[PDB]
Write a protein that binds this ligand. Structure first.
Ligand SMILES: *[C@@H]1O[C@H](CO)[C@@H](O[C@@H]2O[C@H](CO)[C@@H](O[C@@H]3O[C@H](CO[C@H]4O[C@H](CO)[C@@H](O)[C@H](O)[C@@H]4O)[C@@H](O)[C@H](O[C@H]4O[C@H](CO)[C@@H](O)[C@H](O)[C@@H]4O)[C@@H]3O[C@@H]3OC[C@@H](O)[C@H](O)[C@H]3O)[C@H](O)[C@H]2NC(C)=O)[C@H](O[C@@H]2O[C@@H](C)[C@@H](O)[C@@H](O)[C@@H]2O)[C@H]1NC(C)=O
Ligand SMILES: *[C@@H]1O[C@H](CO)[C@@H](O[C@@H]2O[C@H](CO)[C@@H](O[C@@H]3O[C@H](CO)[C@@H](O)[C@H](O[C@H]4O[C@H](CO)[C@@H](O)[C@H](O)[C@@H]4O)[C@@H]3O[C@@H]3OC[C@@H](O)[C@H](O)[C@H]3O)[C@H](O)[C@H]2NC(C)=O)[C@H](O)[C@H]1NC(C)=O
Ligand SMILES: *[C@@H]1O[C@H](CO)[C@@H](O[C@@H]2O[C@H](CO)[C@@H](O[C@@H]3O[C@H](CO)[C@@H](O)[C@H](O)[C@@H]3O[C@@H]3OC[C@@H](O)[C@H](O)[C@H]3O)[C@H](O)[C@H]2NC(C)=O)[C@H](O[C@@H]2O[C@@H](C)[C@@H](O)[C@@H](O)[C@@H]2O)[C@H]1NC(C)=O
Ligand SMILES: *[C@@H]1O[C@H](CO)[C@@H](O[C@@H]2O[C@H](CO)[C@@H](O[C@@H]3O[C@H](CO)[C@@H](O)[C@H](O)[C@@H]3O)[C@H](O)[C@H]2NC(C)=O)[C@H](O[C@@H]2O[C@@H](C)[C@@H](O)[C@@H](O)[C@@H]2O)[C@H]1NC(C)=O
Ligand SMILES: *[C@@H]1O[C@H](CO)[C@@H](O[C@@H]2O[C@H](CO)[C@@H](O)[C@H](O)[C@H]2NC(C)=O)[C@H](O[C@@H]2O[C@@H](C)[C@@H](O)[C@@H](O)[C@@H]2O)[C@H]1NC(C)=O
Ligand SMILES: *[C@@H]1O[C@H](CO)[C@@H](O)[C@H](O)[C@H]1NC(C)=O
Ligand SMILES: OC[C@H]1NC[C@H](O)[C@@H](O)[C@H]1O
Ligand SMILES: OC[C@H]1NC[C@H](O)[C@@H](O)[C@H]1O
Lengths: 391, 390
């Protein structure tokens, strides 16, 4: 979408995976979907270093709404959980130097069953712009027709544009289309800043694997459409939660960087391990994800329970990720000729290789005829940066 | 098996899951299956507290053998990887106050392709006794028929007995005959100290889940047959490796205790985190696993992506494990009427409840009508001990 936004993948925090649709503020006041939750995360996003690392958008997902629209046909924030209203929340978030994201649905209802925006696109766009909203995530539930789905996503894009306010537009259009027909990514890119392709992530290695496998399976269709202003969205980072081992967490961070993915954390920033925090704030890995060239990476090789992915970067550099998919035994060595990397130009005549995950280490100079050898933990990933040089 | 061994579930270390069949001693000398590896693990079992926690048996799995039997028809340790032989290894292990476990296969070959014991059961049994072996794991690969399989497992049990040496006999009899015929656990129990029922564990939450789900599904068949001298083997503990989150590690430790499982670690004791170590050496949880009454636990309840399991202990105590099987969201509130626990006698008229995992914490006295509210992390478990009080 040519709105001048998302020139690099959008970074922020989104409540959905970790907090879901918890409406139980009586029994669980600190975890329920309410203004206090977002106020606290906004505070922590600044004080704990997330904003300085690039995480800018504090985003509200489903279940923020009152059961019904007001008498003027507007969406309302729930009066018990958001008593001060979204406008005051937006102002609070902006006073911290952050941006506010919000959620709506293209159909009759949101996925959790709250009011949908079908027949209200202009009213809702204008309501969000009035409030000071900076990003909309637009879900695809309760839409009976693929025509209405496509038309709704296009209409809201235009409606947001007409407000005059710059609003990142995050779509789930291809995801709700894929079962029934092939998405047209040239069309989607014109209307959306980023788009969900695949099923909801959860806090599991199985889920990370299936997203990587579906991305690599469909990479011919989706890799080349991504670029400044329009990104593939493989869903939230679940690092810092409960279901991923340390190696599995390194794998998600590494591959979301290779894939030029929006980086939306969904975790409890009040309760995050030093390790997960250091991984998520890793300046070098974030720089890869945010590389200004904006060319999405891809799977190069697959075999022997190993995967090799690579991404072209600016300044003639490349990122290489090698995943160990064997879920038994110990570290396994993988050896690859550097001449097979970066379409033969990454280390021609030479290159400097620096390892970034799971630890930072300079590996030295590699000639075009050299072989690269790494040990990789089961379900772990080694991420390298190849810096091309004529020495 | 009535040999006076495994009166509580056997505890130790087994190389297979973490080290497997690595023969590349040229390029990976510290990780290949060699006498060096087992000598190093032995040293660490003593120095780092493993022996004191109860982990006693240092066990060799597949791929220790030479490609061929010797001229006398005996198995031989690989000459390049075990140049000092198994007898010297057994002596070294015994000098550390530990016991030695070894591996063989009922069929013509081991699963990895080395010499099998079919037609050599008495030779091998005697060879192992002569070496001073204290435990045999006996695998089921390359066995043509169910007749041979059954007869093989029985033959080796008797052969071990005839040596006069006390040897723990660890079988895979039910695992390998399940596909074709329902195992007779009464028969299996008479011949074996423990038995593998299900597929090989690996370093994944998926595999932990599958083992628990298959156990609970089959718990009517297998729970009551367990007891002092004969245990169900859900396979190795994989805590301290690569594929399990912290909560998933706690779940395995808690549930292996509930299930009266043999506790065979398969990890690198040279490279293990402090958390994984503290969990594996947790005296209170190990005491549950090793409860002298030796009654295996079972799934009590399933619903709302929660599972409740319990185990009866000695002295009118119970252990209770509540698992959160929802793999999305945050810690989830679970409330249970304590009157549902221990067949209604656990907290009649009252009980003192102590949480053991993921942290140790006295929770206080509960009356029969009370409700316990826990918070359980996704894929995590809360483990409680209930002490009945008047
Ligand atoms: C571990 O591996 C060992 C080596 O492979 C196994 O021993 C084999 O067991 C075979 C049966 O499972 C057995 O096969 C029989 O062989 C008889 C004679 O050999 C013939 O073949 C030779 C070359 O292959 C050849 O040189 C000879 O000239 C012979 O022709 C043969 O008579 C048998 O046939 C019987 O059955 C048929 C069919 O009903 C009748 O028509 C026939 O009259 C006869 O009664 C049989 O051969 C064939 O078996 C397969 C079947 O599909 C064919 O129809 C049938 O013809 C073989 O002798 C040995 N091999 C060796 C080298 O000794 C061992 O098996 C176990 O132990 C053996 C001793 C036996 O007790 C088996 O029942 C056991 O399963 C394997 N053990 C384990 C645990 O896996
Ligand atoms: C509603 O929609 C309209 C379009 O339908 C939006 O107007 C468009 O806004 C963008 C804002 O960037 C504008 O794009 C720029 O155009 C000027 C020339 O007029 C260029 O100098 C810009 O290039 C520079 O900046 C970009 C970063 O955006 C950078 O990539 C370049 O290297 C350079 O430094 C930029 O041109 C774009 O460059 C990137 C390339 O991918 C695009 O194709 C190219 O457009 C558009 O001109 C403008 N479109 C029109 C038709 O006027 C409007 O912002 C939007 N309003 C709201 C509220 O959302
Ligand atoms: C080879 O097999 C035979 C059986 O086929 C083993 O003999 C059995 O060994 C058991 C354990 O040592 C004996 O049971 C014990 O009996 C004594 C006295 O009553 C008692 O102190 C123990 O608590 C135990 O009692 C019960 O035994 C029956 C079980 O139902 C119950 O669970 C136990 O609590 C058992 O009597 C004996 N059976 C027979 C038929 O003789 C034999 O074990 C070896 O012999 C015994 C006597 C002892 O020297 C052991 O150290 C030794 O292992 C076994 N041999 C080998 C080498 O494994
Ligand atoms: C996927 O979506 C893209 C973008 O909408 C489609 O390309 C666009 O197709 C429009 C209508 O077919 C084109 O409009 C034309 O504009 C010119 C102005 O010069 C008029 O003369 C002409 O009558 C049309 O109205 C538009 O040019 C084109 N946009 C872009 C950015 O390429 C695309 O359609 C497919 O490709 C185009 C080039 C044609 O070959 C179509 O026949 C073809 O469907 C969509 N792809 C699919 C598979 O649906
Ligand atoms: C499973 O194995 C059990 C142990 O071998 C069998 O029980 C034993 O059966 C013998 C006769 O086959 C008998 O002499 C033994 O006393 C008895 N052992 C014990 C500890 O009870 C069992 O056999 C079944 O149950 C026995 C009591 C008889 O009713 C048999 O006719 C049955 O087959 C075996 N079960 C099965 C299903 O094969
Ligand atoms: C929404 O449902 C109404 C009936 O409640 C129906 O008239 C309308 O066509 C539906 N629209 C969409 C986009 O699903
Ligand atoms: O109910 C909200 C939920 N709906 C489905 C979406 O794909 C999720 O990301 C989340 O927004
Ligand atoms: O190859 C050895 C391998 N065989 C199959 C067994 O069940 C495993 O535990 C292991 O011993």
């Amino acid at each position: 979408l040519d709105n001048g936004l998302a020139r690099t993948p959008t970074m922020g925090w989104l409540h959905w995976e970790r907090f879901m649709c918890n409406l139980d503020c009586q029994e669980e006041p600190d975890s329920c979907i309410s203004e206090k939750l977002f106020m606290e995360m906004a505070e922590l996003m600044v004080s704990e270093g997330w904003k300085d690392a690039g995480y800018e958008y504090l985003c509200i997902d489903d279940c923020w709404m009152a059961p019904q629209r007001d008498s003027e046909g507007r969406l309302q924030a729930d009066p018990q959980r958001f008593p001060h209203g979204i406008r005051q929340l937006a102002n609070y978030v902006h006073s911290k130097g952050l941006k506010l994201g919000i959620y709506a649905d293209v159909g009759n209802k949101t996925c959790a069953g709250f009011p949908g925006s079908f027949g209200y696109y202009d009213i809702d766009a204008q309501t969000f712009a009035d409030w000071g909203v900076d990003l909309l995530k637009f879900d695809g539930c309760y839409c009976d027709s693929l025509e209405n789905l496509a038309d709704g996503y296009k209409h809201m894009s235009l409606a947001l544009n007409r407000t005059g306010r710059s609003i990142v537009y995050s779509c789930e259009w291809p995801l709700y289309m894929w079962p029934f027909q092939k998405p047209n990514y040239t069309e989607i890119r014109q209307y959306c800043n980023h788009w969900r392709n695949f099923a909801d992530i959860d806090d599991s290695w199985k889920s990370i694997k299936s997203i990587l496998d579906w991305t690599s399976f469909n990479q011919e269709r989706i890799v080349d459409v991504a670029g400044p202003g329009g990104w593939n969205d493989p869903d939230m980072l679940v690092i810092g939660n409960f279901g991923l081992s340390w190696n599995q967490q390194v794998t998600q961070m590494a591959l979301w960087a290779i894939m030029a993915a929006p980086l939306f954390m969904s975790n409890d920033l009040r309760h995050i391990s030093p390790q997960a925090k250091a991984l998520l704030q890793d300046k070098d890995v974030i720089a890869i994800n945010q590389d200004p060239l904006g060319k999405q990476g891809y799977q190069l090789r697959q075999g022997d329970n190993f995967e090799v992915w690579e991404r072209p970067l600016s300044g003639l550099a490349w990122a290489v990720a090698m995943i160990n998919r064997q879920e038994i035994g110990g570290p396994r060595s993988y050896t690859i000729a550097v001449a097979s990397l970066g379409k033969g130009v990454a280390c021609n005549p030479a290159c400097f290789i620096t390892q970034l995950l799971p630890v930072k280490r300079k590996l030295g100079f590699y000639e075009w005829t050299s072989r690269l050898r790494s040990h990789i933990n089961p379900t772990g990933t080694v991420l390298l940066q190849l810096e091309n040089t004529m020495q």
